[PDB]
Amino acid sequence: QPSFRPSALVVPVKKDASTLQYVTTINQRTPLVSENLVVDLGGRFLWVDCDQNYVSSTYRPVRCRTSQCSLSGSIACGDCFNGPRPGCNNNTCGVFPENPVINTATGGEVAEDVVSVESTDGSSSGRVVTVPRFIFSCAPTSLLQNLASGVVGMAGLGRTRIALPSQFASAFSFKRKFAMCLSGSTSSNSVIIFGNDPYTFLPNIIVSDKTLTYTPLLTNPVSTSATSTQGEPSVEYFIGVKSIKINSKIVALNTSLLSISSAGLGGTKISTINPYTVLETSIYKAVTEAFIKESAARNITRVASVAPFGACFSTDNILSTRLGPSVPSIDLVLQSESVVWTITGSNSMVYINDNVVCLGVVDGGSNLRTSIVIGGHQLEDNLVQFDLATSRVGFSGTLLGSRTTCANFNFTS
Ligand SMILES: *[C@@H]1O[C@H](CO)[C@@H](O)[C@H](O)[C@H]1NC(C)=O
Numbered sequence: 001q002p003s004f005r006p007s008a009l010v011v012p013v014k015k016d017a018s019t020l021q022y023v024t025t026i027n028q029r030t031p032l033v034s035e036n037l038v039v040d041l042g043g044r045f046l047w048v049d050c051d052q053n054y055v056s057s058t059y060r061p062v063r064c065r066t067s068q069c070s071l072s073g074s075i076a077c078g079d080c081f082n083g084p085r086p087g088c089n090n091n092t093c094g095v096f097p098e099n100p101v102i103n104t105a106t107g108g109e110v111a112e113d114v115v116s117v118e119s120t121d122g123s124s125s126g127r128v129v130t131v132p133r134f135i136f137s138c139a140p141t142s143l144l145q146n147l148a149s150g151v152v153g154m155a156g157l158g159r160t161r162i163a164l165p166s167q168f169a170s171a172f173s174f175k176r177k178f179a180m181c182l183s184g185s186t187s188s189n190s191v192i193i194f195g196n197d198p199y200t201f202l203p204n205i206i207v208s209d210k211t212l213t214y215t216p217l218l219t220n221p222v223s224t225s226a227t228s229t230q231g232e233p234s235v236e237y238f239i240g241v242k243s244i245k246i247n248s249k250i251v252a253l254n255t256s257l258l259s260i261s262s263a264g265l266g267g268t269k270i271s272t273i274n275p276y277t278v279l280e281t282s283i284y285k286a287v288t289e290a291f292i293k294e295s296a297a298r299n300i301t302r303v304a305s306v307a308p309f310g311a312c313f314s315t316d317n318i319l320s321t322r323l324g325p326s327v328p329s330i331d332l333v334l335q336s337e338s339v340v341w342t343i344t345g346s347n348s349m350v351y352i353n354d355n356v357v358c359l360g361v362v363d364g365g366s367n368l369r370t371s372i373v374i375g376g377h378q379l380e381d382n383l384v385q386f387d388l389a390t391s392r393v394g395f396s397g398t399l400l401g402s403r404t405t406c407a408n409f410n411f412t413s
């Protein structure tokens, strides 16, 4: 039959209750199997356990000195002193797959195999499409430590040619952009949509390049990975937060921490592997103290902290709103005073129980590589678009303002 090239792809994402990781699913191998993979926005590539329960007649090792090896970074050339199979081959290109949850990397072989996912028109699940020789990294079973039950690897979405967004765009000839719509649901799927906009969420809410607010995509010249070579830039997505307001009032910050130095320290990145936004200690202190004060001004009393949080509150006087609990707003001010990432109660707060709610940010310590890491809870129910062709990040704010959610995409497996 003819196989039409897609204009976009959709994969499901579901939050894991125990680990707070976001887990996607793709199909791979011959015969085709479903793979659950932890989403790593900042990861270099797809990596999978090739050592254990990996059977495929379409698997091919990527040899050293090939164009595929170059696409993967020409990091290493390896040999394996065990029997030949997926993950163990001679004269094979190597990389260092990383598990950022445990902050570990280890050597893995580069390989090709069939990857199959659903196309989309932006509104519903469509016909399946395939990349017959999708380049990925093998990894050992031990690298899976502390990942959600049932996963076999990680889906890296970072700024490399072989990461999912770029490799799908090149394979299918669509735009080098993707959109992530994470959910706090642990029972229902949300989505990542690779390729062209627009995106529809039930009932009829359109999110598109018209509706999104954009900010420049910045580059950190020093890697933020666990392994790297000298002179390698970060593959992560940075944005230029200049100031923070809480309840419309500036929270005074050390601005040198918000800039990215030539040594690669500072700035603001977006992460799916940190479940809560992580703040350098001085920023953490400033933000939490202002939030506590502004909360007290509306009769929301501070109560004992609940790990991992350091600013927790009684719910006695908190009103429920469409945009979440009625707590002080937090604005991350970007390239001008009129371009802001706004965090309403649905994204700022984490319920512990009926009586206690916490500000969902954590103290990352002092002398931290990245000063602000926008994490999973703060991404939920927001559509975030990463456009590598135009070097921009777009964001919707909470979809609750439009009476929809990220789990309201019309996805069918
Ligand atoms: C690689 O070559 C070495 C040395 O000849 C050999 O001992 C080993 O079995 C080989 N590994 C394979 C083919 O995966």
Ligand SMILES: *[C@@H]1O[C@H](CO)[C@@H](O)[C@H](O)[C@H]1NC(C)=O
Pocket: 254, 255, 256, 257, 282
């Ligand atoms: C601000 O951050 C820089 C970078 O760490 C540091 O050198 C400086 O001492 C800090 N300033 C204040 C007022 O804490």
Ligand SMILES: *[C@@H]1O[C@H](CO)[C@@H](O)[C@H](O)[C@H]1NC(C)=O
Pocket: 296, 297, 298, 299
């Ligand atoms: C609420 O807090 C405000 C500001 O602190 C205070 O002036 C007011 O008395 C409080 N209202 C109560 C406790 O009903």
Ligand SMILES: *[C@@H]1O[C@H](CO)[C@@H](O)[C@H](O)[C@H]1NC(C)=O
Pocket: 123, 124, 125, 202, 410
């Ligand atoms: C999902 O989209 C398909 C294609 O239009 C449609 O047939 C189906 O009824 C939709 N499902 C929901 C729940 O809207």
